[PDB]
């Protein structure tokens, strides 16, 4: 855990609200689910 070798989940104040979620995906959620099941040989 020395020098931040181990991951820690304490709140980071300076990075809080650093960005706002913006989403631009055309494919609909039902279409997304069907595609991932169909990915590759699956």
């Amino acid at each position: 855990a020395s020098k931040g070798r181990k991951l820690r989940f304490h709140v980071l104040s300076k990075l809080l609200s650093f960005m706002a979620p913006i989403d631009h995906t055309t494919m609909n959620d039902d279409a997304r689910t069907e595609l991932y099941r169909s990915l590759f040989g699956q």
Binding site: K6, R8, F9
Partner: peptide
């Protein structure tokens, strides 16, 4: 607890 990973639920 500092190493416990939080869990999320699919909405």
């Amino acid at each position: 607890k500092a190493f416990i990973p939080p869990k999320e639920k699919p909405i």
